[PDB]
UniProtKB/Swiss-Prot annotation, chain B:
<feature type="binding site">
    <location>
        <position position="119"/>
    </location>
    <ligand>
        <name>phenol</name>
    </ligand>
</feature>
<feature type="binding site">
    <location>
        <position position="163"/>
    </location>
    <ligand>
        <name>Zn(2+)</name>
    </ligand>
</feature>
<comment type="subunit">
    <text>Homodimer.</text>
</comment>
<feature type="binding site">
    <location>
        <position position="91"/>
    </location>
    <ligand>
        <name>phenol</name>
    </ligand>
</feature>
<protein>
    <recommendedName>
        <fullName>Phenol regulator MopR</fullName>
    </recommendedName>
</protein>
<feature type="binding site">
    <location>
        <position position="166"/>
    </location>
    <ligand>
        <name>Zn(2+)</name>
    </ligand>
</feature>
<feature type="binding site">
    <location>
        <position position="140"/>
    </location>
    <ligand>
        <name>Zn(2+)</name>
    </ligand>
</feature>
<comment type="function">
    <text>Involved in the regulation of the phenol degradation pathway. Activates phenol hydroxylase expression in the presence of phenol.</text>
</comment>
<feature type="binding site">
    <location>
        <position position="174"/>
    </location>
    <ligand>
        <name>Zn(2+)</name>
    </ligand>
</feature>
Amino acid sequence: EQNKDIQDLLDKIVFDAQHGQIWFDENRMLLMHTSILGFLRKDLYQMLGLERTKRFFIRCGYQAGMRDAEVTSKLRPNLNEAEAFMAGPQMHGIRGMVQVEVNELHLSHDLKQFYADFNWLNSFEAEVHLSEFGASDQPACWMLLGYACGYSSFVMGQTIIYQETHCVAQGDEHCRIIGKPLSEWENFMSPDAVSDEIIALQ
Amino acid sequence: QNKDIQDLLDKIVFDAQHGQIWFDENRMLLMHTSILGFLRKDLYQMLGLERTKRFFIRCGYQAGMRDAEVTSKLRPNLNEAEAFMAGPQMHGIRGMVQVEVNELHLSHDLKQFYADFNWLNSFEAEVHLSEFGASDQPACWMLLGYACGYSSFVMGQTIIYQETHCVAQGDEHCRIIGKPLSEWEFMSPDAVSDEIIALQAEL
Ligand SMILES: Cc1ccccc1O
Ligand SMILES: Cc1ccccc1O
Ligand SMILES: [Zn+2]
Ligand SMILES: [Zn+2]
C-alpha cells in the first residue's frame, strides 16, 4: 500500500532488466554492491591518508546530493518549502543509503533560514566503515554528510553545512545530524570550497 | 515475462521507508551513472590510469564474486549453462550492461570454458565518453572485472575476459571473449587484475 508520501519519486524510477537499464526519469542509474565503496575506502585510506579519504567522500556525496536536488527541484510546486525539501531525505532512503527520521526541520528560502536535526537510521556507510576499520574515534558517514550538505545547499540557494553529532560508527545507537547555514556556526569550484569546510568538524 | 529472471528478482528487496535495499543478505545502493563517471575522473586525476583501471576491475571482480556466491545457492536443479547465465542476468538487473550470447561452452569438471558475448547498453562506455572523450583502449573495466569474478567463482578457476570491441573506441557495441587463464597465448584477486591489464597490452 502506501507509503503515499514518496510515490511521486518512485513513479519516476523504471527497471528495464532485459535491456541493461535503470532510469530515474531522464537519468540513468545503477544498482551496486556497497563493496565498491568499501574498497574505495580501504584503498584511498592507505594511498592517501584519512583526511584526504574523508574529503573525497564528502565530495562524492556532495555531487550526488546536488544531482538529486537538480532532478527533483521542479517536482513539488503545490507543496510548501519543507514537504518539497524532504525530497532529499526521501531519496537517500529510496537509494538504500540511510533512513531519515526528522527530529526538527524548519526552512524558508527567502528568509534565508534553515535548521535541520535528523536521526539517521541503518546508515549503509556506518556498516561499511566498521567492517573495514572498526570503531572510529569520530563520525564516519562522510558520503551521507556530503549528500546532505550538497542537496540542501542547492535547494536553499546558499551554503548549508551539517555536523554528524552522533554516529553508529562511534558506538552510538543511531547516527544523528544537525544542519544550519554556514554563517551560524563557528569560524563553480565553490562546490569544492564547501567540501573543505564540512572537513572542519568541531 | 521475465520467466527466467524471476528467481533473482525474488532475492531483491526494496525497503524505501527504511533506507535499505537487499540482494539476499547484501545491501545495495541506487546510484547515478554520472556519479560513477565523476568517481572515475577524480580517481584518474589522483592516481592515474593504471591505478584507476586497476581499482575498477578489482571492484567488478569482487561484486561478480559475491553475486556468484549468492546465485550458486539457487538454481541447482538446472544445468551449468542456465545456471551460469544468472551472472549476465544480474548485470542486466543491476542496470549495468545488456548481455547477448554469441557462444558459450562450459564444463566445470572438464575445466573448459569459452564465452563470446556482446555487451549492448554499457553504462561504463557511456560515462567514459562523457569524461574522457573517445578512447584509445576499451573502457569497460568494472564490467570486465565482474565478468572475470563471476565466472572464476562459478568455475573452479581464473577465467579471464578480454574486451574486444568497445563502444568507447567507436565500435557499434562492446564485445567480449572469456577463456581460462591458460588458453591465453592465479587465484589472487589483485593478480587477476594485473593479468587482465598485462594481457590487453600483449594483443
Ligand atoms: C539529512 C539529509 C538532507 C538532505 C538529503 C538527504 C539527507 O539524508
Ligand atoms: C555478468 C557477466 C558474467 C559473466 C560474463 C559476462 C557478464 O556480463
Ligand atoms: Zn554515521
Ligand atoms: Zn565497452
